[PDB]
Amino acid sequence: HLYQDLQREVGSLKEINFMLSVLQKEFLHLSKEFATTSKDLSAVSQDFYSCLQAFRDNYKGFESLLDEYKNSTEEMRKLFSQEIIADLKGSVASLREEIRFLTPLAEEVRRLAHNQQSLTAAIEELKTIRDSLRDEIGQLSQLSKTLTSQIALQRKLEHHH
Ligand code: NA
Ligand code: NA
């Protein structure tokens, strides 16, 4: 019931992995389209590729962590503290909300540029989203890395049985 509870809360990680694959390329494309129009917008759009790639690099690790929680022992669950579970839930929820904001901005920038409108607010929003995603994907990455290492060490120390 704990695993079915957290899994419901976090949702499909594969869905996030796929959507970030789509969006990282959409924004690399945008970065090439505007290289000679807005240096500033091109730079932030290019930044999004590596920012989103960090989640994909860690995707197998995140799925593995969820599986470990699914098959957890009484000793393993102590590593899954309430603080850590809350951090997992809140960073994944943050990713989903940020993606909701990020998705329409590529076309919005294309539309603004066509009608010669100011790109300032779009660039500011893209910078804010990039920084937020960097923070949350990095927190998720570190959380998963630490927990998996702790689980491995606990199992290694149980090997004597
Ligand atoms: Na596309
Ligand atoms: Na968090």
Numbering used by the authors: 91 to 251
Lines from the paper:
In this paper, we describe the molecular architecture of the prototypical bacterial SNARE-like protein IncA, which mediates the homotypic fusion of chlamydial inclusions. IncA is a protein of 273 amino acids composed of a short, cytoplasmic N-terminal moiety (residues 1–34), a bilobed transmembrane domain (residues 35–84), and a long cytoplasmic C-terminal domain that ends in a tail with low complexity (residues 247–273). We demonstrate that IncA folds into a stable, non-canonical four-helix bundle that is maintained as a monomer by intramolecular interactions. Cells infected with an IncA-deficient strain of C. trachomatis similarly displayed multiple inclusions at a high multiplicity of infection, further establishing that IncA is required for the homotypic fusion of inclusions.
To characterize these regions, we first generated a G144A hinge mutant variant and found that IncA87–246(G144A) remains monomeric in solution and it has comparable structural stability as IncA87–246. IncA87–246(G144A) crystallized in a triclinic space group with two IncA87–246(G144A) protomers in the unit cell. Though this crystal form did not diffract as well as the previous one, we were able to collect 88.1% complete data to 1.95 Å resolution and determine an accurate atomic model of IncA87–246(G144A) using molecular replacement. The structure, solved to a Rwork/free of 16.9/21.2 at 1.95 Å resolution, contains two four-helix bundles where the interrupted α-helix HB of IncA87–246 is replaced by a straight continuous helix. Interestingly, the two IncA87–246(G144A) protomers in the triclinic unit cell are noticeably dissimilar (RMSD 1.65 Å), with protomer B characterized by a local unfolding of helix A between residues 100VGSL103. In both protomers, this region is not implicated in crystal contacts, which suggests IncA87–246(G144A) may exist in solution in different microstates, also populated in the crystal lattice. Secondary structure superimposition of IncA87–246 with the reference IncA87–246(G144A) protomer A reveals the G144A mutation results in significant conformational changes throughout the molecule (RMSD 1.68 Å), especially in the helix HD, which is shifted upwards in IncA87–246(G144A). Simulation of IncA87–246(G144A) revealed a spike in RMSF at residue 231, a feature which is absent in both the IncA87–246 and IncA87–237 RMSF profiles. This result agrees with the structural plasticity of IncA87–246(G144A) protomers seen in the triclinic crystal form, which deviate significantly at the C-terminus of helix HD. However, when G144 of the hinge is mutated to alanine, the HD–Hclamp distance narrows and results in a significantly less flexible Hclamp during simulation compared with IncA87–246 and IncA87–237, which may explain experimental results regarding the lack of IncA87–246(G144A) oligomerization in solution.
